[PDB]
Amino acid sequence: GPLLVWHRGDLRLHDHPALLEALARGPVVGLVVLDPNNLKTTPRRRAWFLENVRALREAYRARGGALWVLEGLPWEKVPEAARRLKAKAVYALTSHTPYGRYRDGRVREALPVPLHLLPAPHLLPPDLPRAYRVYTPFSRLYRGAAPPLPPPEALPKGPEEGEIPREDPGLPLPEPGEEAALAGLRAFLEAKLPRYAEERDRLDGEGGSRLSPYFALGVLSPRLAAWEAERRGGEGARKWVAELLWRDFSYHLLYHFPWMAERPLDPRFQAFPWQEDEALFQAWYEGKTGVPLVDAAMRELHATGFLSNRARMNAAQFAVKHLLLPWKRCEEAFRHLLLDGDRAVNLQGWQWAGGLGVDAAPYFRVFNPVLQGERHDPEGRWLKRWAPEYPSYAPKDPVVDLEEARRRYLRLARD
Ligand SMILES: Cc1cc2nc3c(=O)[nH]c(=O)nc-3n(C[C@H](O)[C@H](O)[C@H](O)COP(=O)(O)OP(=O)(O)OC[C@H]3O[C@@H](n4cnc5c(N)ncnc54)[C@H](O)[C@@H]3O)c2cc1C
């Protein structure tokens, strides 16, 4: 009987504990279940997922192995695959998300054979005992990346089943799959890593790796990335790895403070006068606020599904501090437009850029839409690409009075 390796947010063969744990015991067959709880989202994200699932199968085939793809509820499809294959056991990577736990508990209940869950690779586990709300103390626990596990050279033969739907992303998608991700990592490390600390703030984000869409679906292991970067060493690597840690910190936060999905980490904001004005929401959502920077960010986001970190913190804080739009609605809409949309990470980003309690970031910090755009975009090349209509980062008929908007917020916050 074979062993089933059930892939979830880990569409890769490199550094995969569940794959190697099963392979060491006997022949394996891979499995992906197209779950409605995950796929009932926007076309761009659904396609990104499906195309990376298609790539994993090609990766299995290239090695002579078999990847089954089934559609439906995990607690019905996993047991079905196990029965049909007469699998002895199922192996997967542990998930600590609310849905992940519910799902796996349900699957364990319906499965007649063992479900073995192994720790997913992280720089720092999210289920650490101590619960930190600040980054520095959390990051100190990190003592360098452990070595990544190797991918199999070849896979045992097995029967293949299931078809992989083709969805219209509505936009240009990056190259899907692990090979593309690995090629991207090498390019970044050799070319951009050295100056990362000095270029990581550009509004166009060309100083970054642009690997978030891959990390989001586990096409690239963070442990492998950290390991490679640290092999290069230097200020660049230290800084880039620090950002990988911010991702783990995001999972750590949501795991220890589940309620932050519902309310701000900082209690003294639980009752902020969020003015829900449908008219303003659309202006922001469509990037029609009249503010060069924000409009540029939202426009690129709608067209590409990607946005540099600097742009995200600008477009995000603008909505929360200036327009006072409720964060909950804005964060969901933001996530749905991102190819790398990750609930935990997006939530930390919003509660951080929105001065809602993450890393005890100060509320009094308020970005200056025009300065920001000039200090992080030289010949205004970025602005000229997403909002040519604007001659500069100067407000041309703003949906609100920046100056008053600032005073307004600071006033509200101060109390
Ligand atoms: C309001 C807001 C929302 C965000 N939502 C998401 C989201 O849904 N999904 C997502 O992947 N990232 C999110 N980020 C974090 C971040 O902006 C990206 O990970 C980054 O822009 C990816 O570009 P890159 O791959 O070139 O990053 P690089 O600079 O090359 O960094 C490498 C990796 O480190 C991680 N990383 C970098 N910055 C951060 C950060 N601030 N927090 C957590 N991890 C980080 C990412 O995995 C990234 O791929 C958000 C940030 C903000 C301010």
UniProtKB/Swiss-Prot annotation:
GO molecular function, one term: DNA binding
BP term (GO), one: response to light stimulus
Coiled-coil ranges (or none): none
Result, substituting W352A: Strongly reduces interaction with DNA. Reduces CPD repair activity by 80%
Compositional bias segments (type: Basic and acidic residues): 158-169
Cofactor details (free text): Binds 1 FAD per subunit.
Residues annotated as binding FAD: Y196, G208, S209, R210, L211, S212, W240, R247, N309, D340, G341, D342
EC number(s) on file: 4.1.99.3
EC primary class: lyase
Annotated stretches, region: Interaction with DNA: 243-250, 309-310
Binding-site residues for DNA, renumbered to this chain: R200, Q372
Pfam families: DNA_photolyase, FAD_binding_7
Cofactor requirements of the protein: FAD
Region (Disordered): 146-175
Residues marked Electron transfer via tryptophanyl radical (site): W274, W327, W350
Catalysed conversion reaction: cyclobutadipyrimidine (in DNA) = 2 pyrimidine residues (in DNA)
SUPFAM superfamilies named in the record: Cryptochrome/photolyase FAD-binding domain, Cryptochrome/photolyase, N-terminal domain
Protein family membership: Belongs to the DNA photolyase class-1 family.
Role of this protein: Involved in repair of UV radiation-induced DNA damage. Catalyzes the light-dependent monomerization (300-600 nm) of cyclobutyl pyrimidine dimers (in cis-syn configuration), which are formed between adjacent bases on the same DNA strand upon exposure to ultraviolet radiation.
Subunit relationships: Monomer.
Name of this chain's protein: Deoxyribodipyrimidine photo-lyase
Organism: Thermus thermophilus (strain ATCC 27634 / DSM 579 / HB8)
Lineage of producing organism: Bacteria, Thermotogati, Deinococcota, Deinococci, Thermales
